[PDB]
Amino acid sequence: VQLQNVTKAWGEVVVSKDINLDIHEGEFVVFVGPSGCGKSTLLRMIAGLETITSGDLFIGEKRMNDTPPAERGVGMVFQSYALYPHLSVAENMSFGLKLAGAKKEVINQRVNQVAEVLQLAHLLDRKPKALSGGQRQRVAIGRTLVAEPSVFLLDEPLSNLDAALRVQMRIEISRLHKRLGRTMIYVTHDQVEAMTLADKIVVLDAGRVAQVGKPLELYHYPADRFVAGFIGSPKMNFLPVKVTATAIDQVQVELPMPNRQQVWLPVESRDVQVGANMSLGIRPEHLLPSDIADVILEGEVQVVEQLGNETQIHIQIPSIRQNLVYRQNDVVLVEEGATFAIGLPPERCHLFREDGTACRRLHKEPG
Amino acid sequence: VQLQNVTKAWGEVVVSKDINLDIHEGEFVVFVGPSGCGKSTLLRMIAGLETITSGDLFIGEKRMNDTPPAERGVGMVFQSYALYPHLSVAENMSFGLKLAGAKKEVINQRVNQVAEVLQLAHLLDRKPKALSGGQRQRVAIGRTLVAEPSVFLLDEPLSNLDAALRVQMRIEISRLHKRLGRTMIYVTHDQVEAMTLADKIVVLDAGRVAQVGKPLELYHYPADRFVAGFIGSPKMNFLPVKVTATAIDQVQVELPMPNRQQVWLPVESRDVQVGANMSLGIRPEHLLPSDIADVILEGEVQVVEQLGNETQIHIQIPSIRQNLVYRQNDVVLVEEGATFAIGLPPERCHLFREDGTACRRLHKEPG
């Protein structure tokens, strides 16, 4: 699967601008982004269920822009797929692949096989009705699974399933993905899942492609502020700062804290001017405990949540409008109003220009 | 609010055993549990929507089993509300707090306030009927989001809103619980949410009230196997162990691995006999990094999930069917098939009899 200049609009309303994705055979790619990143359309644009008003689309190799959906070699499942009311569970799950199958021999084999793996063995001879809504969805998945299509299109397939089932299926997915080394494209909002399944994640924004790379690549090296703010749940912290000096691959910034402290960051230094107001990023998880000074940020506690395995502390700081979110392991016992101190590790700070573009971090991160 | 021996079913096949909840006022209470635990039904059963085939229900102070819906003294804006295609948005999010209430201090202060932290302001009055693939939601639920009844009753609200207009809600609903010192009954599958919103949590399993208490009390002192395995994800690790000795504030067990190491655990010891086959539980976040050699577990790395802020390692252990997940902060690079060693802390372990009943931990957890 490959895309070259793919574009789509409705007169002027654009929802897919110049996208070029080069998906290699066997790769498990994951599409992420917010509300209208248009990540679903694009999945649909690939299956044919949506028109491509420009550019090219190849699958297998041959151009596919005008190939009816059922002939592209792709398979699909999404949110709450509807099964065939009259067909039994076993009848479903086999529907596809039946549509060109080596008779009961193969069908009645991939079925029961893929059945066990989805904890459905004891439902084979039943109807879509008198069946849990969580099992129905698993059935929907099964079909695509026994068909072993050339390319799997998955759109938040486990959305239905509840925590403590979605983990089992999130695993069966990879297992299957490994056995049948066929290409797979997945869409979600569950960032763990993404980081867990993907070989490559494509982050979408405004219909455009914000960035593509391996999981730990987008995490340690966001290409811009949008991606920095998008990958990672207790969103990265951004502190307005002013640059006070630049040297070969260095660049010094003046923090918002009183005593106007200056800190040198190991970053690209390319398109950065002395006096330019830029942004600094620091993930809640990378903020130091304070027992390690060297640039300390102090403020007053606003919120405090006990997750039981960790503790997120919302800290306010005069000369920092927005709060600073912090993550510390286990149980820290601090009440609201109390005063809290944390540390700022320079080798883990990001620096974005007004442009919003990142100043290539130079700290070699493992992995 | 409060319940007693409430039994729900139809005439024989139960769907809600003798539950005896007791919800003081001003208390934010969350219901959690797997799929068909019935946590939902019970919700409706409180708001009348369901016939309580037994028991009693004291909303406020007066029984209300027979007392029809509307007239109850509650609130409750279910999952996805049904708008009014005809009545423009100038005729939405009200009805209640309309036929009465001082002139303009009803739909100006109370009503007009929720469309605040949802970007809402573009839908002030514009007819919702066939707007966007998710714009009539704002003009569906909030239809009764303000009347300040005696007790609220929600059900899996913020679910189709990305890690955006949902996190803020967990910041707003809890805010309303500040001003409106009223009572609420939230229901979800978002464990962080539950843990971050409730003052008290009831965990239901097959219409059975598994246990009730504060967040950290369910995390630190689960009443039994069910609850220890349900709160927290990844799930708690469980190992089969045989009890070799007992005292009046200990209980000794024999780990599975070779050299059958024995360890004394700080637990109840009440109903436990030498020889019994019990289950030891230790949370992945609590396993230790082996440089602390007092009772170690060693195995071959199977899975290694890199989440960016942490790293999860699945370790296959000899003479223990299932693997053993381990959570560690940061990167930690480890290839599969490798040999890994972790620390197993006696304070942090749990112990369950065949009953699945937990042997009360005697160590006091701070918090």
CATH code: domain of residue A253: 2.40.50.100
Are A220 and B308 within 8 A, CB to CB? yes
Chain B hits for A310, Cβ within 8 Å: 285
Sheet holding A324-329, edge to edge: A324-329, A310-316, A296-306, A339-343
Tell me the sheet residues that pair with A13: A10
Which of B197, B217, B235 is a domain's end point? B235
Q: Is the distance from CB of B142 to CB of B93 less than 8 angstroms? A: yes
Q: Is residue A229 domain-resident?
A: yes
Place of tokens 């006990």: A306
Task: Tell me the C-alpha distance between B229 and B236, whole Å.
Answer: 6
Q: Is the distance from CB of B202 to CB of B28 less than 8 angstroms? A: no
Looking at residue B203, its amino acid is: V
Chain A hits for B219, Cβ within 8 Å: 308-309
Task: Select from B193, B332, B159, B307 the least CA-distant residue to A191.
Answer: B307
- Name the resolution in angstroms: 2.8
Nearest CA in chain A to B175: A303
Count the domains in chain B: 3
E-only strand ranges, chain B:
3-4, 6-8, 16-19, 28-32, 56-57, 184-187, 200-205, 208-213, 237-245, 252-254, 262-264, 277-282, 296-306, 310-317, 320-329, 339-343, 350-352
Q: Is the distance from CB of A324 to CB of A290 less than 8 angstroms? A: no
Pick from A231, A308, A367: CB nearest B215: A308
Task: Tell me the C-alpha distance between B260 and B254, whole Å.
Answer: 6
Place of tokens 């997750």: A307
Same domain? For B246 and B175 the reply is: no
Total count of residues recorded for chain B: 367
Structure tokens at A43: 């999945």
Structure tokens at B339: 């040999």
Task: Tell me the C-alpha distance between A73 and A56, whole Å.
Answer: 17
Same domain? For A212 and A168 the reply is: yes
Same domain? For A122 and A220 the reply is: yes
Same domain? For A221 and A251 the reply is: no
User: What values do phi and psi take at B217, rounded to 5?
Assistant: -85, -25
| Residue B279 assigned to a binding site | no
E-only strand ranges, A33-73:
54-59, 62-63
Pick from B34, B196, B329: CB nearest A162: B34
Q: What is the CATH number of the domain that holds B332?
A: 2.40.50.140
Are B196 and A307 within 8 A, CB to CB? yes
| Residue B11 assigned to a binding site | no
Same domain? For B27 and B121 the reply is: yes
Q: Is residue B218 domain-resident?
A: yes
| Residue A38 assigned to a binding site | yes
User: What values do phi and psi take at A144, rounded to 5?
Assistant: -50, -35
Same domain? For B339 and B354 the reply is: no
Same domain? For A257 and A192 the reply is: no
State the number of CA atoms in the 13 A half-sphere of B135 facing the CB: 18
Task: Tell me the C-alpha distance between A300 and B265, whole Å.
Answer: 40
Q: Is the dihedral of CA A65, A67, A70, A73 positive or negative?
A: negative
Are B331 and A219 within 8 A, CB to CB? no
Q: What contacts B271, CB < 8 A, 6 or more positions away?
A: B353, B357
Chain B hits for A331, Cβ within 8 Å: 216, 365-367
Q: Is the dihedral of CA A98, A101, A103, A109 positive or negative?
A: negative
Q: Is residue B112 domain-resident?
A: yes
Task: Tell me the C-alpha distance between B158 and B188, whole Å.
Answer: 9
Same domain? For A307 and A245 the reply is: no
Place of tokens 């942004």: A279
The DSSP element (H or E) to which A177 belongs, if any, is helix A166-179
User: What values do phi and psi take at A104, rounded to 5?
Assistant: -40, -30
* Longest pairwise C-alpha distance within chain B: 80
Task: Select from A222, A269, A220, A221 the least CA-distant residue to A243.
Answer: A269
Same domain? For B92 and B170 the reply is: yes
List the end-to-end C-alpha distance of chain B, in Å, as a whole number. 27
Are A134 and B162 within 8 A, CB to CB? no
Nearest C-alpha of chain B: how many angstroms from A143? 23
The DSSP element (H or E) to which B177 belongs, if any, is helix B169-179
Range of the domain at B39: 1-235
Task: Select from B109, B88, B82 the least CA-distant residue to B97.
Answer: B109
Task: Select from B193, B211, B192 the least CA-distant residue to B201.
Answer: B211
For helices A103-117 and A133-147, give the axis angle rounded to 10 degrees: 130
How determined?
A: X-ray
Same domain? For B180 and B52 the reply is: yes
Identify the three-state secondary structure at position B219: helix
Q: What is the CATH number of the domain that holds A138?
A: 3.40.50.300
Chain B hits for A132, Cβ within 8 Å: 35-36
Can you spell out the DSSP letters for B97-134? TTSSSSTTSSTTTTSTTGGGTTS-SS-SSS--TT--TT
